[PDB]
């Protein structure tokens, strides 16, 4: 049931980090879970610092919300920023100090593919407005895997590319007119890229949309609340049809409605 985004609900806090290491981070579930994982499996990465390698894995939502991890993976190279996703059994993440996306197969703890995103800025060239080296933002939607970035040729405007999830080849690319550094974060729903206006305001908005199917850009005024005033990560999960976000120590989720 696809459609245009028309409403975002209030943020619900599912877990709060207890140390500064989790001031920012990414948490996620797999919209295409494969054995041995399920739709309840949750991953959490606290991303403050310069040697981020620990990925916390929880078999059950109850464990994610109240307990210790059921497994900790140690990535073979340090991860950059909050943009990572899980899709069809693999963590897709950006190597620190690089424009390289890595496919890390979770069950086998193996790197299956690596790809430089052609021309992408990295390490503070085209971050979102809060900084945090957020130059490269992976996304999953109803159609699969994407990457959101910018290039010098695009003059810092958001570029988005569909990715082959097996080998990380770029399949198609679109260029928006939205300055990446001017928005707080972005995500894709049903092939439309949406941006959030502010990472600090309790009265922010989903403020722009770009539809990859029609090429049309629009403004929007949909309310979006940063309850804790520092949102470092905002992604969409197409299986749950919810936003997942990280706001100033807090792992939160938002319900949505589509037309
Ligand atoms: Ca995002
Ligand atoms: Na992402």
Numbering used by the authors: 244 to 502
Q: What is written in the article reporting this PDB entry?
A:
Inherited missense mutations in the myocilin (MYOC) gene, within its olfactomedin (OLF) domain, constitute the strongest genetic link to primary open-angle glaucoma via a toxic gain of function, and thus MYOC is an attractive precision-medicine target. Myocilin has no known function, and there is no glaucoma phenotype in Myoc knockout mice or in individuals with a homozygous N-terminal truncation mutation or hemizygous deletion of MYOC, but rare non-synonymous coding mutations lead to toxic intracellular sequestration of misfolded myocilin. However, not all mutations in MYOC cause glaucoma, and common variants are expected to be neutral polymorphisms. Among the common features associated with pathogenic myocilin misfolding, we demonstrate that a single metric, OLF thermal stability, can robustly segregate benign from early-onset disease variants.
At the outset of our study, five variants could be confidently predicted as benign polymorphisms: T293K, T353I, K398R, A445V and K500R. These mutations are all found on the protein surface and well documented in the literature. Three of these variants harbor conservative substitutions (Lys to Arg, Ala to Val). Assessment of spent media from cells expressing each of the 16 full-length myocilin variants revealed WT-like secretion for T256M, R296H, L303I, S313F, V329M, S331L, T353I, A445V, V449I and K500R. Analysis of the intracellular detergent-soluble fractions revealed E300K to be a statistical outlier among the variants, but T256M, S313F, N420Y, and A445V also presented decreased soluble protein levels compared to those of WT myocilin. Structural integrity was further confirmed by high-resolution crystal structures, which were solved for 11 OLF variants. No gross changes from WT OLF were detected for the structures of T293K, R296H, L303I, V329M, S331L, E352K, T353I, K398R, A445V, V449I or K500R, indicating that these mutations are accommodated within the native five-bladed β-propeller fold and do not perturb the dinuclear calcium-containing site.
